[PDB]
Amino acid sequence: QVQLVQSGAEVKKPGASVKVSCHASGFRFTDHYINWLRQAPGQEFEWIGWINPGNSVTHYAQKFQARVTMTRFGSTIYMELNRLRSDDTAVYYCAREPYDFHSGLEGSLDYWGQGTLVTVSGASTKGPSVFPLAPSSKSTSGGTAALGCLVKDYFPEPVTVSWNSGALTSGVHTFPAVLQSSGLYSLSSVVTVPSSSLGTQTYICNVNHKPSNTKVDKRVEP
Amino acid sequence: DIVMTQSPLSLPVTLGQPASISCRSSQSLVHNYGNTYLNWFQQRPGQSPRRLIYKVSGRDSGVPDRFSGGGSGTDFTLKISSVEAEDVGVYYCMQGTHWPRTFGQGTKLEINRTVAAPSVFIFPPSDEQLKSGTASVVCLLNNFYPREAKVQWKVDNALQSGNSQESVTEQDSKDSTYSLSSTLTLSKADYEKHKVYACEVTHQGLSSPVTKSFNRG
Ligand SMILES: *[C@@H]1O[C@H](CO)[C@@H](O)[C@H](O)[C@H]1NC(C)=O
């Protein structure tokens, strides 16, 4: 099965460098080369370039030609962007492009990675505080209860939140982050569970803020 | 260097109805042995792109039959015969004839379904948080349509004017609904100055405003 697993979200200061990873599996680089692109939120996709993961022969768009470097080791492809600036904050993607030994690169992308968020900021990073959103009688509806986790005061984005170590995904709503007046983010993740289960099942929010290397497992009790 | 333009930048479509998106290129996308390298990708909320169409009219196994693509030279079209809940997201066109690869601005397929009333919940400040100095009350609106909803914070029947944040999710890939989170934040001092904290919600699926509330004590 084809998988393109990229590295974690990073945060650098202006002028510094960022190196992004893309580990490939399920195919060979013999007949599949690797593209790197990026996407600013409000913008569309910008194409960064491609690499032949065999001989490490590269081809960069002129916009990034001066400060980009694509490399490879084993089944992992790296994309290094130097002299970072404020408008380099975007979600970076790797993508697979099949290769024919006659006619060469097919003009298409078939598989993408999950992408990595890269933000450029001089500000220091800050891990999040995690407070419970406890299920109450004010949280119950049609025999269903809603509980959650409030992730506050972190910088920068993003924070990933799972529930019960990936054993719970149904009814989960992880809301988009909100910027406070402090200059810090804050988001809330919630889930609807059976009310009849509030005394038998265990509900844990797993919070990860990789830019600060912070991991918080909070237990939500009724 | 080969500019791509998409004709409806936003496309409100009711379920079970067809839809079409146009892509226009500044140059001819025909290459070598007559191959026209035009691609159509789909990007659902919070996911990676997924290829729907290759070489103008090619479609992989796994991509639904309701997806088709046509056109020629500098004018192409992606068509969905009957729009479904999972079709929500942003669609892109991408050329592969020349370098650099270029995309369209993207078409936002906004899905329209029956009116859904929101599930209104509320959460009092945590005990761990109160020991820090701040208090955050959370108002939760679950699975409603349309997207337009009003949330009003009431502190002892006093309409609040500037101590809350708000956030709306993207459209759900299964029920085409929305969810909303409001967070009223005060100092532990200002939290302990009042008693009743309420969120009043106004939405088209509610005959009368639903007011959730909790009193300290
Ligand atoms: C959206 O779909 C509903 C369900 O059939 C339909 O009645 C309505 O007219 C559509 N659009 C609007 C503007 O409500």
B20 lines ligand 1 (CB under 6 A): no
Residue among A58, A63, A129, A138 with most chain B CBs within 10 A, to mutate: A138
Contact A61 B49 (CB under 8 A): no
Those residues whose C-beta lies under 8 Å from the C-beta of residue A220, and which sit 6 or more positions away, are A132, A133, A134, A135, A147, A148, A149, A203, A204, A205
Q: How far is CA A143 from the centre of its chain?
A: 35
At B128 the three-state DSSP class reads helix
Q: E strands within B30-81?
A: 30-31, 35-36, 38-43, 50-54, 58-59, 67-72, 75-80
Q: What's the burial of B162, exposed, middle or buried (CB within 10 Å: 0-12/13-18/19+)?
A: exposed
| Whether the Cβ atoms of residue A47 and residue A90 lie closer than 8 Å to each other | no
Q: What's the burial of B96, exposed, middle or buried (CB within 10 Å: 0-12/13-18/19+)?
A: buried
Q: How far is CA A209 from the centre of its chain?
A: 10
* Resolution limit, Å: 2.7
Nearest to B70 by CA among B57, B54, B84: B57
Whether the domain at A1-122 and the domain at A123-222 fall into the same CATH topology: yes
Those residues whose C-beta lies under 8 Å from the C-beta of residue A73, and which sit 6 or more positions away, are none
What is the distance between the alpha carbons of residues B68 and B79, in angstroms, rounded to a whole number? Answer: 5
Q: What's the burial of B207, exposed, middle or buried (CB within 10 Å: 0-12/13-18/19+)?
A: exposed
Place of tokens 């008693």: B195
Of B102, B106, B140, the CB nearest to A146: B140
Q: How far is CA B6 from the centre of its chain?
A: 19
| Whether the Cβ atoms of residue B109 and residue B13 lie closer than 8 Å to each other | yes
Whether the domain at B1-112 and the domain at B113-217 fall into the same CATH topology: yes
Contact A106 B100 (CB under 8 A): no
Contact B123 A131 (CB under 8 A): no
* Domain residue limits, chain A: 1-122, 123-222
What is the distance between the alpha carbons of residues A219 and A201, in angstroms, rounded to a whole number? Answer: 11
**B105 φ, ψ (degrees, to nearest 5):** -75, -20
What is the distance between the alpha carbons of residues A215 and B82, in angstroms, rounded to a whole number? Answer: 44
**Domain B1-112, CATH homologous superfamily name and number:** Immunoglobulins (2.60.40.10)
Ligand 1: distance of its center to the CA of B110 in Å? Answer: 12
* Domain residue limits, chain B: 1-112, 113-217
Ligand 1: distance of its center to the CA of A181 in Å? Answer: 39
The listed CATH number (2.60.40.10, 1.20.1050.40, 2.60.40.420, 3.30.565.10) that belongs to domain B113-217: 2.60.40.10
Q: Does B212 touch chain A (CB under 8 A)?
A: yes
Give ∠ CA B107-B108-B114 in degrees, rounded to 5.
Answer: 140
Q: Give domain A123-222's CATH architecture.
A: Sandwich (2.60)
What is the distance between the alpha carbons of residues A44 and B23, in angstroms, rounded to a whole number? Answer: 14
Those residues whose C-beta lies under 8 Å from the C-beta of residue A197, and which sit 6 or more positions away, are none
Three-state SS string over B76-114 comes to EEEEECCCCHHHCEEEEEEECCCCCCCECCCEEEEEECC
Q: Give domain A1-122's CATH architecture.
A: Sandwich (2.60)
Q: Which atom of ligand 1 is nearest to the CA of B114?
A: 4
Kindly list the residues from chain A whose CB atom is less than 8 angstroms away from the CB atom of residue B121: 138-139, 141, 146
Name the B residues in 109-148 with CB < 8 Å from any A CB.
119, 121-126, 128-129, 132, 136, 138, 140, 142
